[PDB]
Amino acid sequence: NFMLTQPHSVSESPGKTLTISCTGSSASIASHYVQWYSIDSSSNSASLTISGLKTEDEADYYCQSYDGNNHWVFGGG
Amino acid sequence: NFMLTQPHSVSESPGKTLTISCTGSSASIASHYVQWYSIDSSSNSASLTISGLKTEDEADYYCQSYDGNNHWVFGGG
Amino acid sequence: NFMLTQPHSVSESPGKTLTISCTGSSASIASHYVQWYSIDSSSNSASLTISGLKTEDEADYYCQSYDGNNHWVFGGG
Amino acid sequence: NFMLTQPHSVSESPGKTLTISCTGSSASIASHYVQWYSIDSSSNSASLTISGLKTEDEADYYCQSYDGNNHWVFGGG
Amino acid sequence: NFMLTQPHSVSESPGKTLTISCTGSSASIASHYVQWYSIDSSSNSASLTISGLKTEDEADYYCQSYDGNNHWVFGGG
């Protein structure tokens, strides 16, 4: 999980900016993800019966970003 | 999971900007994802009966972004 | 978990900026992630019955970022 | 877990800036992560019954960032 | 766990700045992480019954950051 908020921001950035690669994979059960723009805020998850769960996952991430002056240069992933 | 909010923002960015590659794969059950623009906010997930779940996933991510001055340069993914 | 907030910010950054690679993988059950822009704030998760969970995960992360003047340079991942 | 807040900030940084690689993987049950922009703030998680959980995870992180003038230089991950 | 706050800050830093690699992996149950921007602040986690949990995790972190003038230089991870 990576979570970023900038509720306010002043940026002067003549730049390479927000570059995001390979953000990994999420498996979720009954999970709530919430961002909405007497006051009551409620998210209710309950009375859940779970039986035996077996998970076997093989994940290989190969992420390559190049800014390169390269002679005979070999990159192996 | 990658989550970004900029509820307000001032940016001066003569730039490469928001570049997103290979954001991984999500498997979800009964999950709620919410973003809506006496007050009651309710999302209710309940009384769920789950029997044995077996998951075997093989995921390989090969993501290549090039800005390159390259001679005889070989990239293997 | 990586969490960043800048509720206010003044930045002068003619730069390479926020560069994010391979942020890892999250498995969550009934978890709540919340960021919303008498007052009561409530998120309720309860009465959950969990039976034996077996998890065997193999994750290899190979993340390569290059700014390089390289001759006969070999990178192995 | 890495958590950063800059509720206010003045930065002059013509620089390489916030560069984030391989932030590791989190497995969470019923966990709440909260950042929202008589007053009562409440997050309630209760009455959870957990039976024996066996977790065997193999995680190898290979993260390579190069600023290099390199001849016959070999990097092994 | 690494936690940083700069509720105010004046920095002049034409520099390499906050560079974060391999921040390790956290397994948490019912844990709350909170940063929100008569007044009562309450986060309540209670009445949790946990039976024997066995965890066997093998984690190897190989993190390489180079600023190098290198001849025949070999790095092994």
mmCIF file of C-alpha atoms in Angstrom:
data_model
loop_
_atom_site.group_PDB
_atom_site.id
_atom_site.type_symbol
_atom_site.label_atom_id
_atom_site.label_comp_id
_atom_site.label_asym_id
_atom_site.label_seq_id
_atom_site.Cartn_x
_atom_site.Cartn_y
_atom_site.Cartn_z
ATOM 1 C CA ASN A 1 0.000 0.000 0.000
ATOM 2 C CA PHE A 2 1.209 3.457 -1.001
ATOM 3 C CA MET A 3 -1.099 6.370 -0.172
ATOM 4 C CA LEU A 4 -0.418 10.030 -0.957
ATOM 5 C CA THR A 5 -2.541 13.124 -0.334
ATOM 6 C CA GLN A 6 -1.699 16.779 -1.008
ATOM 7 C CA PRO A 7 -4.769 18.583 0.365
ATOM 8 C CA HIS A 8 -3.014 21.765 -0.699
ATOM 9 C CA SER A 9 0.222 22.249 -2.604
ATOM 10 C CA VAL A 10 2.280 24.884 -4.422
ATOM 11 C CA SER A 11 4.947 23.319 -6.644
ATOM 12 C CA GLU A 12 7.269 24.813 -9.258
ATOM 13 C CA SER A 13 8.772 21.739 -10.893
ATOM 14 C CA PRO A 14 10.080 21.928 -14.459
ATOM 15 C CA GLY A 15 10.898 18.333 -14.017
ATOM 16 C CA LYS A 16 10.323 14.714 -14.549
ATOM 17 C CA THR A 17 7.304 14.219 -12.295
ATOM 18 C CA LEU A 18 5.170 11.521 -10.760
ATOM 19 C CA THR A 19 6.406 8.322 -12.394
ATOM 20 C CA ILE A 20 4.903 5.097 -11.081
ATOM 21 C CA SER A 21 5.967 1.601 -12.147
ATOM 22 C CA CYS A 22 4.967 -1.927 -11.091
ATOM 23 C CA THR A 23 2.826 -1.003 -8.065
ATOM 24 C CA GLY A 24 2.100 -4.470 -6.760
ATOM 25 C CA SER A 25 -1.001 -6.611 -6.685
ATOM 26 C CA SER A 26 -3.555 -6.658 -3.863
ATOM 27 C CA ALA A 27 -5.928 -9.477 -2.892
ATOM 28 C CA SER A 28 -8.639 -8.263 -0.523
ATOM 29 C CA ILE A 29 -11.775 -9.715 1.069
ATOM 30 C CA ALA A 30 -14.624 -7.456 2.219
ATOM 31 C CA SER A 31 -12.130 -4.576 2.370
ATOM 32 C CA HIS A 32 -13.409 -1.017 1.940
ATOM 33 C CA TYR A 33 -11.395 1.714 0.239
ATOM 34 C CA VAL A 34 -12.986 5.118 0.699
ATOM 35 C CA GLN A 35 -12.309 8.642 -0.545
ATOM 36 C CA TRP A 36 -15.401 10.849 -0.946
ATOM 37 C CA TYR A 37 -15.361 14.619 -1.385
ATOM 38 C CA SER A 38 -26.006 15.373 13.084
ATOM 39 C CA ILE A 39 -23.468 14.035 10.571
ATOM 40 C CA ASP A 40 -22.518 10.349 10.616
ATOM 41 C CA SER A 41 -19.939 8.603 8.422
ATOM 42 C CA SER A 42 -20.266 4.816 8.502
ATOM 43 C CA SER A 43 -18.779 1.850 6.641
ATOM 44 C CA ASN A 44 -19.831 -1.453 8.210
ATOM 45 C CA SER A 45 -18.389 -4.912 7.506
ATOM 46 C CA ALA A 46 -19.463 -7.609 9.942
ATOM 47 C CA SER A 47 -20.661 -11.144 10.661
ATOM 48 C CA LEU A 48 -18.237 -12.709 8.176
ATOM 49 C CA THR A 49 -17.481 -16.439 8.449
ATOM 50 C CA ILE A 50 -14.287 -17.519 6.671
ATOM 51 C CA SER A 51 -13.112 -21.108 6.192
ATOM 52 C CA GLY A 52 -9.585 -22.232 5.536
ATOM 53 C CA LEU A 53 -7.880 -20.240 2.768
ATOM 54 C CA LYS A 54 -4.671 -21.438 1.100
ATOM 55 C CA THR A 55 -2.802 -18.943 -1.101
ATOM 56 C CA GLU A 56 0.414 -19.688 -3.024
ATOM 57 C CA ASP A 57 1.469 -16.812 -5.303
ATOM 58 C CA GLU A 58 4.713 -16.371 -7.259
ATOM 59 C CA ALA A 59 5.256 -12.761 -8.364
ATOM 60 C CA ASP A 60 8.429 -11.477 -10.043
ATOM 61 C CA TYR A 61 8.675 -7.761 -10.850
ATOM 62 C CA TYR A 62 11.229 -6.586 -13.431
ATOM 63 C CA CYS A 63 11.032 -2.814 -13.891
ATOM 64 C CA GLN A 64 13.616 -0.960 -15.980
ATOM 65 C CA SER A 65 13.893 2.827 -16.394
ATOM 66 C CA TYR A 66 16.807 4.077 -18.511
ATOM 67 C CA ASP A 67 18.528 7.429 -18.921
ATOM 68 C CA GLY A 68 21.709 6.003 -20.368
ATOM 69 C CA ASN A 69 24.855 6.659 -22.381
ATOM 70 C CA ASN A 70 25.763 3.004 -22.773
ATOM 71 C CA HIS A 71 28.312 1.013 -24.781
ATOM 72 C CA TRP A 72 28.081 -2.807 -24.714
ATOM 73 C CA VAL A 73 25.796 -2.489 -21.677
ATOM 74 C CA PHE A 74 23.568 -5.488 -20.962
ATOM 75 C CA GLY A 75 20.718 -5.467 -18.457
ATOM 76 C CA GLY A 76 19.279 -8.777 -17.307
ATOM 77 C CA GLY A 77 15.917 -9.183 -15.602
ATOM 78 C CA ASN B 1 -2.998 -0.517 -3.923
ATOM 79 C CA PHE B 2 -1.804 2.946 -4.921
ATOM 80 C CA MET B 3 -4.104 5.839 -4.013
ATOM 81 C CA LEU B 4 -3.483 9.518 -4.760
ATOM 82 C CA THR B 5 -5.675 12.550 -4.077
ATOM 83 C CA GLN B 6 -4.944 16.238 -4.700
ATOM 84 C CA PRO B 7 -8.060 17.922 -3.278
ATOM 85 C CA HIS B 8 -6.400 21.174 -4.287
ATOM 86 C CA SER B 9 -3.182 21.782 -6.187
ATOM 87 C CA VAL B 10 -1.191 24.497 -7.961
ATOM 88 C CA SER B 11 1.509 23.027 -10.209
ATOM 89 C CA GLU B 12 3.795 24.615 -12.802
ATOM 90 C CA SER B 13 5.348 21.604 -14.507
ATOM 91 C CA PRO B 14 6.651 21.911 -18.070
ATOM 92 C CA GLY B 15 7.529 18.317 -17.733
ATOM 93 C CA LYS B 16 7.077 14.695 -18.356
ATOM 94 C CA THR B 17 4.000 14.054 -16.227
ATOM 95 C CA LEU B 18 1.951 11.285 -14.711
ATOM 96 C CA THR B 19 3.338 8.123 -16.288
ATOM 97 C CA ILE B 20 1.929 4.859 -14.970
ATOM 98 C CA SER B 21 3.076 1.396 -16.050
ATOM 99 C CA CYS B 22 2.127 -2.157 -15.031
ATOM 100 C CA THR B 23 -0.004 -1.284 -11.984
ATOM 101 C CA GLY B 24 -0.737 -4.774 -10.761
ATOM 102 C CA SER B 25 -3.875 -6.858 -10.726
ATOM 103 C CA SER B 26 -6.379 -6.975 -7.862
ATOM 104 C CA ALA B 27 -8.755 -9.829 -7.003
ATOM 105 C CA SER B 28 -11.466 -8.760 -4.569
ATOM 106 C CA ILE B 29 -14.550 -10.352 -3.004
ATOM 107 C CA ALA B 30 -17.448 -8.221 -1.744
ATOM 108 C CA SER B 31 -15.015 -5.292 -1.616
ATOM 109 C CA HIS B 32 -16.369 -1.752 -1.945
ATOM 110 C CA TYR B 33 -14.470 1.022 -3.708
ATOM 111 C CA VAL B 34 -16.078 4.398 -3.135
ATOM 112 C CA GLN B 35 -15.479 7.944 -4.347
ATOM 113 C CA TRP B 36 -18.596 10.134 -4.625
ATOM 114 C CA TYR B 37 -18.579 13.916 -4.939
ATOM 115 C CA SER B 38 -29.244 14.275 9.399
ATOM 116 C CA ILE B 39 -26.707 12.951 6.879
ATOM 117 C CA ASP B 40 -25.722 9.273 6.918
ATOM 118 C CA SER B 41 -23.171 7.571 4.655
ATOM 119 C CA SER B 42 -23.434 3.778 4.689
ATOM 120 C CA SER B 43 -21.946 0.868 2.736
ATOM 121 C CA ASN B 44 -22.853 -2.480 4.303
ATOM 122 C CA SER B 45 -21.339 -5.893 3.515
ATOM 123 C CA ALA B 46 -22.273 -8.642 5.953
ATOM 124 C CA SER B 47 -23.374 -12.214 6.638
ATOM 125 C CA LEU B 48 -20.951 -13.686 4.098
ATOM 126 C CA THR B 49 -20.144 -17.412 4.275
ATOM 127 C CA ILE B 50 -16.944 -18.408 2.463
ATOM 128 C CA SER B 51 -15.739 -21.969 1.854
ATOM 129 C CA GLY B 52 -12.199 -23.033 1.176
ATOM 130 C CA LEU B 53 -10.465 -20.922 -1.484
ATOM 131 C CA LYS B 54 -7.221 -22.027 -3.154
ATOM 132 C CA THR B 55 -5.392 -19.450 -5.296
ATOM 133 C CA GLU B 56 -2.174 -20.090 -7.253
ATOM 134 C CA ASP B 57 -1.185 -17.169 -9.508
ATOM 135 C CA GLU B 58 2.062 -16.646 -11.445
ATOM 136 C CA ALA B 59 2.560 -13.016 -12.510
ATOM 137 C CA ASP B 60 5.724 -11.657 -14.151
ATOM 138 C CA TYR B 61 5.915 -7.926 -14.912
ATOM 139 C CA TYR B 62 8.460 -6.670 -17.466
ATOM 140 C CA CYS B 63 8.193 -2.897 -17.872
ATOM 141 C CA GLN B 64 10.726 -0.952 -19.947
ATOM 142 C CA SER B 65 10.895 2.844 -20.328
ATOM 143 C CA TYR B 66 13.764 4.189 -22.448
ATOM 144 C CA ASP B 67 15.389 7.590 -22.843
ATOM 145 C CA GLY B 68 18.599 6.242 -24.305
ATOM 146 C CA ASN B 69 21.746 6.983 -26.283
ATOM 147 C CA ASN B 70 22.715 3.351 -26.733
ATOM 148 C CA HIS B 71 25.313 1.442 -28.755
ATOM 149 C CA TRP B 72 25.120 -2.380 -28.765
ATOM 150 C CA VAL B 73 22.830 -2.153 -25.721
ATOM 151 C CA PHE B 74 20.648 -5.195 -25.044
ATOM 152 C CA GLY B 75 17.831 -5.273 -22.503
ATOM 153 C CA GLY B 76 16.490 -8.664 -21.429
ATOM 154 C CA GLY B 77 13.166 -9.104 -19.675
ATOM 155 C CA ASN C 1 2.968 0.481 3.908
ATOM 156 C CA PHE C 2 4.233 3.898 2.846
ATOM 157 C CA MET C 3 1.995 6.864 3.674
ATOM 158 C CA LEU C 4 2.727 10.505 2.839
ATOM 159 C CA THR C 5 0.650 13.634 3.439
ATOM 160 C CA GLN C 6 1.534 17.269 2.715
ATOM 161 C CA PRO C 7 -1.500 19.134 4.085
ATOM 162 C CA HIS C 8 0.325 22.269 3.002
ATOM 163 C CA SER C 9 3.579 22.658 1.109
ATOM 164 C CA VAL C 10 5.703 25.228 -0.726
ATOM 165 C CA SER C 11 8.343 23.580 -2.915
ATOM 166 C CA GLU C 12 10.695 24.996 -5.546
ATOM 167 C CA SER C 13 12.144 21.876 -7.140
ATOM 168 C CA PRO C 14 13.432 21.999 -10.716
ATOM 169 C CA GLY C 15 14.195 18.395 -10.248
ATOM 170 C CA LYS C 16 13.534 14.786 -10.750
ATOM 171 C CA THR C 17 10.540 14.358 -8.448
ATOM 172 C CA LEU C 18 8.369 11.693 -6.904
ATOM 173 C CA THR C 19 9.506 8.470 -8.563
ATOM 174 C CA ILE C 20 7.935 5.288 -7.225
ATOM 175 C CA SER C 21 8.897 1.752 -8.264
ATOM 176 C CA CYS C 22 7.817 -1.734 -7.146
ATOM 177 C CA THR C 23 5.694 -0.710 -4.140
ATOM 178 C CA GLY C 24 4.913 -4.134 -2.760
ATOM 179 C CA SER C 25 1.788 -6.234 -2.634
ATOM 180 C CA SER C 26 -0.775 -6.181 0.180
ATOM 181 C CA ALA C 27 -3.202 -8.938 1.197
ATOM 182 C CA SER C 28 -5.904 -7.630 3.528
ATOM 183 C CA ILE C 29 -9.082 -8.990 5.120
ATOM 184 C CA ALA C 30 -11.892 -6.652 6.206
ATOM 185 C CA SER C 31 -9.343 -3.821 6.357
ATOM 186 C CA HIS C 32 -10.539 -0.240 5.874
ATOM 187 C CA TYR C 33 -8.439 2.444 4.198
ATOM 188 C CA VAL C 34 -10.000 5.871 4.579
ATOM 189 C CA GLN C 35 -9.232 9.367 3.316
ATOM 190 C CA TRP C 36 -12.267 11.635 2.851
ATOM 191 C CA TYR C 37 -12.122 15.400 2.415
ATOM 192 C CA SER C 38 -22.805 16.603 16.732
ATOM 193 C CA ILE C 39 -20.270 15.154 14.279
ATOM 194 C CA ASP C 40 -19.401 11.450 14.418
ATOM 195 C CA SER C 41 -16.829 9.606 12.296
ATOM 196 C CA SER C 42 -17.241 5.827 12.422
ATOM 197 C CA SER C 43 -15.788 2.808 10.618
ATOM 198 C CA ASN C 44 -16.944 -0.462 12.185
ATOM 199 C CA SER C 45 -15.559 -3.954 11.519
ATOM 200 C CA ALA C 46 -16.721 -6.625 13.944
ATOM 201 C CA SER C 47 -17.986 -10.135 14.677
ATOM 202 C CA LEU C 48 -15.573 -11.774 12.228
ATOM 203 C CA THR C 49 -14.869 -15.508 12.583
ATOM 204 C CA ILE C 50 -11.677 -16.667 10.855
ATOM 205 C CA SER C 51 -10.530 -20.281 10.484
ATOM 206 C CA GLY C 52 -7.025 -21.473 9.848
ATOM 207 C CA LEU C 53 -5.311 -19.594 7.007
ATOM 208 C CA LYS C 54 -2.132 -20.895 5.358
ATOM 209 C CA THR C 55 -0.224 -18.485 3.097
ATOM 210 C CA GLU C 56 2.972 -19.329 1.187
ATOM 211 C CA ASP C 57 4.057 -16.507 -1.142
ATOM 212 C CA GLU C 58 7.303 -16.137 -3.108
ATOM 213 C CA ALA C 59 7.903 -12.550 -4.252
ATOM 214 C CA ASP C 60 11.105 -11.343 -5.935
ATOM 215 C CA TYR C 61 11.419 -7.643 -6.786
ATOM 216 C CA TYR C 62 14.000 -6.550 -9.375
ATOM 217 C CA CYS C 63 13.880 -2.781 -9.873
ATOM 218 C CA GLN C 64 16.506 -1.004 -11.976
ATOM 219 C CA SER C 65 16.862 2.771 -12.423
ATOM 220 C CA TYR C 66 19.801 3.932 -14.554
ATOM 221 C CA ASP C 67 21.595 7.239 -15.002
ATOM 222 C CA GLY C 68 24.737 5.727 -16.446
ATOM 223 C CA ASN C 69 27.887 6.290 -18.481
ATOM 224 C CA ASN C 70 28.730 2.613 -18.814
ATOM 225 C CA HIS C 71 31.242 0.544 -20.790
ATOM 226 C CA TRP C 72 30.958 -3.270 -20.646
ATOM 227 C CA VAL C 73 28.681 -2.862 -17.614
ATOM 228 C CA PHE C 74 26.424 -5.826 -16.856
ATOM 229 C CA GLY C 75 23.540 -5.745 -14.392
ATOM 230 C CA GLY C 76 22.078 -9.048 -13.203
ATOM 231 C CA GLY C 77 18.707 -9.315 -11.502
ATOM 232 C CA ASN D 1 5.926 0.958 7.774
ATOM 233 C CA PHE D 2 7.219 4.366 6.714
ATOM 234 C CA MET D 3 5.010 7.362 7.513
ATOM 235 C CA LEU D 4 5.806 10.980 6.641
ATOM 236 C CA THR D 5 3.799 14.161 7.191
ATOM 237 C CA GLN D 6 4.783 17.761 6.426
ATOM 238 C CA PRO D 7 1.782 19.719 7.740
ATOM 239 C CA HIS D 8 3.687 22.788 6.608
ATOM 240 C CA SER D 9 6.958 23.059 4.724
ATOM 241 C CA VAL D 10 9.147 25.551 2.858
ATOM 242 C CA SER D 11 11.753 23.813 0.695
ATOM 243 C CA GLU D 12 14.139 25.148 -1.945
ATOM 244 C CA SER D 13 15.530 21.976 -3.488
ATOM 245 C CA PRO D 14 16.820 22.013 -7.064
ATOM 246 C CA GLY D 15 17.525 18.410 -6.518
ATOM 247 C CA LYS D 16 16.788 14.806 -6.940
ATOM 248 C CA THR D 17 13.808 14.480 -4.599
ATOM 249 C CA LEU D 18 11.588 11.868 -3.033
ATOM 250 C CA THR D 19 12.641 8.617 -4.693
ATOM 251 C CA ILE D 20 10.994 5.483 -3.337
ATOM 252 C CA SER D 21 11.878 1.914 -4.329
ATOM 253 C CA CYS D 22 10.718 -1.530 -3.160
ATOM 254 C CA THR D 23 8.625 -0.416 -0.165
ATOM 255 C CA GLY D 24 7.781 -3.807 1.258
ATOM 256 C CA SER D 25 4.610 -5.834 1.405
ATOM 257 C CA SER D 26 2.044 -5.685 4.214
ATOM 258 C CA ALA D 27 -0.445 -8.373 5.263
ATOM 259 C CA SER D 28 -3.117 -6.969 7.571
ATOM 260 C CA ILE D 29 -6.322 -8.233 9.186
ATOM 261 C CA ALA D 30 -9.072 -5.810 10.236
ATOM 262 C CA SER D 31 -6.454 -3.040 10.354
ATOM 263 C CA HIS D 32 -7.561 0.560 9.815
ATOM 264 C CA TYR D 33 -5.415 3.189 8.106
ATOM 265 C CA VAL D 34 -6.935 6.640 8.422
ATOM 266 C CA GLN D 35 -6.114 10.103 7.099
ATOM 267 C CA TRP D 36 -9.113 12.411 6.600
ATOM 268 C CA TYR D 37 -8.910 16.161 6.085
ATOM 269 C CA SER D 38 -19.511 17.804 20.457
ATOM 270 C CA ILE D 39 -17.031 16.267 18.002
ATOM 271 C CA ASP D 40 -16.234 12.547 18.188
ATOM 272 C CA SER D 41 -13.712 10.620 16.079
ATOM 273 C CA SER D 42 -14.194 6.851 16.271
ATOM 274 C CA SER D 43 -12.815 3.777 14.501
ATOM 275 C CA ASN D 44 -14.043 0.552 16.106
ATOM 276 C CA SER D 45 -12.744 -2.979 15.473
ATOM 277 C CA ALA D 46 -13.948 -5.583 17.949
ATOM 278 C CA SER D 47 -15.269 -9.051 18.774
ATOM 279 C CA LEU D 48 -12.913 -10.793 16.340
ATOM 280 C CA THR D 49 -12.237 -14.517 16.816
ATOM 281 C CA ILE D 50 -9.088 -15.777 15.078
ATOM 282 C CA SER D 51 -7.972 -19.413 14.858
ATOM 283 C CA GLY D 52 -4.491 -20.657 14.177
ATOM 284 C CA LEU D 53 -2.803 -18.890 11.255
ATOM 285 C CA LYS D 54 0.346 -20.266 9.611
ATOM 286 C CA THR D 55 2.292 -17.920 7.320
ATOM 287 C CA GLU D 56 5.472 -18.858 5.430
ATOM 288 C CA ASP D 57 6.619 -16.085 3.074
ATOM 289 C CA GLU D 58 9.864 -15.826 1.094
ATOM 290 C CA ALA D 59 10.546 -12.272 -0.104
ATOM 291 C CA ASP D 60 13.772 -11.182 -1.811
ATOM 292 C CA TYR D 61 14.187 -7.506 -2.714
ATOM 293 C CA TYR D 62 16.791 -6.522 -5.322
ATOM 294 C CA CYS D 63 16.749 -2.759 -5.865
ATOM 295 C CA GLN D 64 19.411 -1.061 -7.986
ATOM 296 C CA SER D 65 19.833 2.702 -8.464
ATOM 297 C CA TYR D 66 22.779 3.796 -10.617
ATOM 298 C CA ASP D 67 24.630 7.067 -11.098
ATOM 299 C CA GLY D 68 27.734 5.465 -12.525
ATOM 300 C CA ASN D 69 30.903 5.923 -14.550
ATOM 301 C CA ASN D 70 31.660 2.223 -14.826
ATOM 302 C CA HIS D 71 34.142 0.070 -16.751
ATOM 303 C CA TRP D 72 33.804 -3.735 -16.528
ATOM 304 C CA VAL D 73 31.504 -3.233 -13.529
ATOM 305 C CA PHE D 74 29.214 -6.162 -12.735
ATOM 306 C CA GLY D 75 26.292 -5.995 -10.320
ATOM 307 C CA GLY D 76 24.774 -9.228 -9.057
ATOM 308 C CA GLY D 77 21.365 -9.497 -7.418
ATOM 309 C CA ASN E 1 8.550 1.288 11.780
ATOM 310 C CA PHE E 2 10.035 4.633 10.740
ATOM 311 C CA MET E 3 7.950 7.745 11.432
ATOM 312 C CA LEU E 4 8.901 11.319 10.519
ATOM 313 C CA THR E 5 6.993 14.577 10.986
ATOM 314 C CA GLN E 6 8.075 18.140 10.168
ATOM 315 C CA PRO E 7 5.117 20.198 11.432
ATOM 316 C CA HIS E 8 7.082 23.218 10.260
ATOM 317 C CA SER E 9 10.364 23.418 8.388
ATOM 318 C CA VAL E 10 12.588 25.861 6.498
ATOM 319 C CA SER E 11 15.177 24.065 4.366
ATOM 320 C CA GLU E 12 17.572 25.329 1.699
ATOM 321 C CA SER E 13 18.920 22.111 0.216
ATOM 322 C CA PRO E 14 20.175 22.057 -3.370
ATOM 323 C CA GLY E 15 20.836 18.453 -2.769
ATOM 324 C CA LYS E 16 20.024 14.857 -3.132
ATOM 325 C CA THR E 17 17.090 14.587 -0.725
ATOM 326 C CA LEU E 18 14.849 12.009 0.872
ATOM 327 C CA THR E 19 15.764 8.731 -0.819
ATOM 328 C CA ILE E 20 14.046 5.648 0.568
ATOM 329 C CA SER E 21 14.813 2.053 -0.436
ATOM 330 C CA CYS E 22 13.578 -1.353 0.764
ATOM 331 C CA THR E 23 11.510 -0.167 3.749
ATOM 332 C CA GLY E 24 10.628 -3.520 5.237
ATOM 333 C CA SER E 25 7.432 -5.500 5.455
ATOM 334 C CA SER E 26 4.889 -5.250 8.278
ATOM 335 C CA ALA E 27 2.336 -7.863 9.362
ATOM 336 C CA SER E 28 -0.324 -6.356 11.620
ATOM 337 C CA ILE E 29 -3.596 -7.507 13.183
ATOM 338 C CA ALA E 30 -6.283 -4.987 14.161
ATOM 339 C CA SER E 31 -3.586 -2.294 14.312
ATOM 340 C CA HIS E 32 -4.591 1.330 13.726
ATOM 341 C CA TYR E 33 -2.392 3.917 12.012
ATOM 342 C CA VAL E 34 -3.873 7.392 12.242
ATOM 343 C CA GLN E 35 -2.976 10.815 10.868
ATOM 344 C CA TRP E 36 -5.924 13.183 10.335
ATOM 345 C CA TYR E 37 -5.626 16.926 9.808
ATOM 346 C CA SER E 38 -16.138 18.969 24.068
ATOM 347 C CA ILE E 39 -13.670 17.308 21.683
ATOM 348 C CA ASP E 40 -12.928 13.586 21.994
ATOM 349 C CA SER E 41 -10.468 11.562 19.905
ATOM 350 C CA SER E 42 -11.036 7.810 20.169
ATOM 351 C CA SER E 43 -9.793 4.694 18.378
ATOM 352 C CA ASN E 44 -11.063 1.521 20.045
ATOM 353 C CA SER E 45 -9.866 -2.045 19.422
ATOM 354 C CA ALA E 46 -11.100 -4.579 21.953
ATOM 355 C CA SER E 47 -12.493 -8.000 22.849
ATOM 356 C CA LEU E 48 -10.187 -9.825 20.430
ATOM 357 C CA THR E 49 -9.545 -13.539 21.011
ATOM 358 C CA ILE E 50 -6.419 -14.882 19.294
ATOM 359 C CA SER E 51 -5.288 -18.523 19.251
ATOM 360 C CA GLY E 52 -1.827 -19.791 18.513
ATOM 361 C CA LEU E 53 -0.195 -18.171 15.479
ATOM 362 C CA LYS E 54 2.936 -19.626 13.868
ATOM 363 C CA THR E 55 4.906 -17.396 11.483
ATOM 364 C CA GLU E 56 8.089 -18.440 9.651
ATOM 365 C CA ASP E 57 9.253 -15.749 7.212
ATOM 366 C CA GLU E 58 12.517 -15.567 5.258
ATOM 367 C CA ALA E 59 13.244 -12.044 4.001
ATOM 368 C CA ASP E 60 16.494 -11.014 2.297
ATOM 369 C CA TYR E 61 16.948 -7.360 1.326
ATOM 370 C CA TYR E 62 19.582 -6.461 -1.282
ATOM 371 C CA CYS E 63 19.600 -2.708 -1.901
ATOM 372 C CA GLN E 64 22.307 -1.090 -4.027
ATOM 373 C CA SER E 65 22.806 2.657 -4.556
ATOM 374 C CA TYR E 66 25.803 3.664 -6.680
ATOM 375 C CA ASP E 67 27.705 6.901 -7.183
ATOM 376 C CA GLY E 68 30.793 5.232 -8.565
ATOM 377 C CA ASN E 69 33.959 5.614 -10.614
ATOM 378 C CA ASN E 70 34.659 1.899 -10.825
ATOM 379 C CA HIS E 71 37.109 -0.331 -12.701
ATOM 380 C CA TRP E 72 36.695 -4.122 -12.390
ATOM 381 C CA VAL E 73 34.399 -3.510 -9.405
ATOM 382 C CA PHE E 74 32.068 -6.397 -8.576
ATOM 383 C CA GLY E 75 29.114 -6.175 -6.205
ATOM 384 C CA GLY E 76 27.572 -9.384 -4.905
ATOM 385 C CA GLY E 77 24.147 -9.628 -3.298
#
